[PDB]
Structures are given as structure tokens and as C-alpha cells.
Amino acid sequence: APQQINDIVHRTITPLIEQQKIPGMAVAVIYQGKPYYFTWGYADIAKKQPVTQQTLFELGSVSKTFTGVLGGDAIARGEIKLSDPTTKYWPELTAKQWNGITLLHLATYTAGGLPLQVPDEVKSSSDLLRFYQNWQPAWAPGTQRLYANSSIGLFGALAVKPSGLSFEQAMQTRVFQPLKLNHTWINVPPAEEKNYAWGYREGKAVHVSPGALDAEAYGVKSTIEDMARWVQSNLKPLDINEKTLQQGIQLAQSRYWQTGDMYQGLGWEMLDWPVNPDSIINGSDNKIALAARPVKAITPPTPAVRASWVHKTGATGGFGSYVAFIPEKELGIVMLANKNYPNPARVDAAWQILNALQ
Numbered sequence: 185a186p187q188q189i190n191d192i193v194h195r196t197i198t199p200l201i202e203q204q205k206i207p208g209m210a211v212a213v214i215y216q217g218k219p220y221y222f223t224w225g226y227a228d229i230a231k232k233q234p235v236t237q238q239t240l241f242e243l244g245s246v247s248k249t250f251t252g253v254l255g256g257d258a259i260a261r262g263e264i265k266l267s268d269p270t271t272k273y274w275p276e277l278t279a280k281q282w283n284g285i286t287l288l289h290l291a292t293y294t295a296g297g298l299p300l301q302v303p304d305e306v307k308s309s310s311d312l313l314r315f316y317q318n319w320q321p322a323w324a325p326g327t328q329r330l331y332a333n334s335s336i337g338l339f340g341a342l343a344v345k346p347s348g349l350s351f352e353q354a355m356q357t358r359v360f361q362p363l364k365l366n367h368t369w370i371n372v373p374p375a376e377e378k379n380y381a382w383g384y385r386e387g388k389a390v391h392v393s394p395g396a397l398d399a400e401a402y403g404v405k406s407t408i409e410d411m412a413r414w415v416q417s418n419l420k421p422l423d424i425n426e427k428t429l430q431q432g433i434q435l436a437q438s439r440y441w442q443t444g445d446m447y448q449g450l451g452w453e454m455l456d457w458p459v460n461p462d463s464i465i466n467g468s469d470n471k472i473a474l475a476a477r478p479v480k481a482i483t484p485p486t487p488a489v490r491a492s493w494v495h496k497t498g499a500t501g502g503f504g505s506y507v508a509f510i511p512e513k514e515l516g517i518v519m520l521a522n523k524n525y526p527n528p529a530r531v532d533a534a535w536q537i538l539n540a541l542q
């Protein structure tokens with residue numbers, strides 16, 4: 185690999201792994217469109233299995249970017265509109281607070297205070313209907329952003345209804361397959377189990393627990409190679425041959441709302457490049473990222489801006505992921521680790537690497 189990339193990546197990631205006690209990590213840098221890969225440490229500490237370019241990691245909320253793109257593809261297909269009331273796709277949702285809450289609100293966490301988690305107590309489909317029917321918004325729709333699995337998770341489930349496909353079926357056939365993401369999974373198959381890293385939480389090996397709307401909000405697992413290809417696809421959607429998918433990727437990077445210096449896409453979040461690193465670094469801390477913030481509607485949404493830092497953090501109990509890219513520069517990074525370590529450390533390392541390469 186070019187020595188510049190080798191040095192920049194190793195000088196940043198090595199101390200990060202040491203400081204954060206990360207058991208295993210994979211990184212891809214996309215530079216001028218081509219991927220370069222780096223691996224450290226262990227997928228499975230007990231069985232002494234190293235991290236490789238084929239290791240599967242839990243993406244956590246990086247999964248929201250796939251959900252956003254799949255939703256975008258459904259809009260491009262003419263199956264849904266972001267302006268369509270939620271109740272159009274879930275007629276049983278008759279409670280009055282849902283009047284005026286659209287698919288856009290669900291996709292972008294602006295429905296008016298849907299909670300971060302779906303309660304663990306929600307096990308059945310009737311439990312899910314009950315939860316949404318009884319939910320009381322704190323705010324009018326489209327006025328405040330509150331990051332939430334229960335918001336974009338519902339969006340994903342409703343977005344695929346017109347297709348008649350399950351969420352998993354829709355994701356596989358409309359996103360994973362056309363992009364040749366052949367080691368990316370919502371449910372890790374037995375054939376790929378030997379590659380599935382353990383996550384580590386307080387020293388214990390863990391995998392993500394089953395839960396309501398898990399697939400839609402945080403349930404994707406992938407390898408560093410497939411994630412590099414995901415970044416390439418989002419960097420350059422015009423190279424994608426499937427028209428609705430190309431369009432969906434573009435829609436997911438449109439700017440729908442602004443809060444402070446960040447813009448909300450579908451799954452993706454974006455800031456103007458050049459960024460103030462303190463802004464993205466401090467902004468990624470869950471103390472800010474998960475806060476209720478007033479939003480300004482972008483009316484109409486700005487189409488994907490090439491001079492953007494586009495990114496998403498993801499976590500599960502045992503895993504911590506980060507993806508960031510800058511379309512204008514054909515530059516990006518994926519960092520996948522089997523420990524959920526603090527977001528600002530992820531973003532700081534990412535910015536150090538991309539800034540040195542740009």
C-alpha cells in the first residue's frame with residue numbers, strides 16, 4: 185500500500201487500540217476510490233481467531249444507512265412517498281396523535297419524541313401496535329429531533345410494505361445483491377458463523393440480542409471488504425447500474441433538517457466540508473447525539489452535496505463501528521471494532537486519517 189496511507193492509518197489506530205483496549209479491529213481507507221485494508225487483534229479471544237478481511241462485525245446503527253437507502257430505493261420505485269402519512273401504510277394506527285406524522289418524520293427522528301428504544305417488553309406484533317398507538321408525543325411533528333431506533337425502525341418496516349417483501353428479503357434483493365455485498369447479513373447464516381466475531385462488553389463475549397425492529401434499526405453484520413464497497417457505492421452513486429438504487433442512495437444523502445451544523449439525511453448524517461473537527465468530534469458524543477434538539481426544516485430538501493462529510497456511528501453492546509466519507513474527494517474510511525468504545529475517539533481518529541490524506 186502507499187506508505188502515506190500505511191503510516192497515517194497505523195500511527196492513528198495503534199494508539200487508539202491501546203488506549204481503548206479494543207480486542208480486534210478492521211479499517212478500510214478508500215483513497216481515490218480504491219480500498220486499502222488493515223486488521224488488528226482478535227475476532228474471538230478465547231479461540232485465538234484473528235481479525236481478517238472476512239471477519240463479520242455488528243454494524244449497530246450504521247445499519248440505519250442501509251435502511252435509509254432501502255427506503256430511498258422504494259421512493260425511487262414509486263412505492264412510497266416521504267410525504268405520505270404513516271397511517272397510509274399502517275391503517276390500524278388510528279390514534280389521533282398520528283395525524284400529521286409522515287414517513288419523513290419517522291425516517292429522520294422528527295415525529296415528536298419517539299423513544300430511543302422500543303421497550304424490551306414488546307415481543308409480539310400486537311405489542312408493537314399497542315406501543316405506537318399509546319405513545320404520546322412531547323412535540324408537534326417536524327419541530328424537534330430525537331435520535332431513535334423506534335422512529336427509523338418503523339420507517340424501514342413500513343417502507344417495504346408495498347413491495348410485499350419482508351424487510352430482510354427487500355434488503356437482500358434490492359441493496360445487498362446489486363452492490364455485490366455478498367458477506368453482509370441481517371441474520372448471519374450458519375455458513376458464515378466461523379467468521380462472526382464476538383463482541384466484548386466488560387470482558388464478556390456477546391452478540392446483539394433479538395428485539396423488535398432490530399433488523400431495521402441496528403441489525404446488519406458485515407465485513408470490512410463489503411463495508412468498503414458500501415462506502416464506494418455511497419461516494420459514487422452514478423456508477424450504480426440499478427436506476428432506483430442509484431436514486432435511493434442520492435435521496436438518503438439529501439438534507440432534510442438542520443440542527444446546529446449538522447444535516448439529517450435518511451440514515452446518513454452530513455456536515456459541510458471542510459468541517460470543524462471539534463464540531464463532529466464533540467457532536468458524536470452520545471451526550472449531544474442522543475439529545476432532543478430543535479430542527480429547521482429544509483424546504484425543499486437540498487440534494488446530496490458533494491462537499492460534505494457524510495457519516496454515521498454505530499454500536500451494539502459488544503461492537504463499535506464508524507463510517508465517514510467525503511464525496512468531493514473520493515475519500516472515506518470504515519472502522520469496525522468488537523468493543524463499543526466512545527464515539528469521539530472514533531471520529532477523532534477518522535478525521536486525523538482523512539484530513540492527512542485529503
Ligand SMILES: *[B]([O])([O])[C][N]S(=O)(=O)[C]C1=[C][C]=[C]C(C([O])=O)=[C]1
Binds near residue numbers: 333392401
Ligand atoms: B445505534 O448504534 O445508535 C443503536 N445502538 S443500540 O445500542 O441501541 C443497538 C442495540 C439495541 C438493543 C440491543 C442491543 C444488543 O447489543 O443486545 C443493541
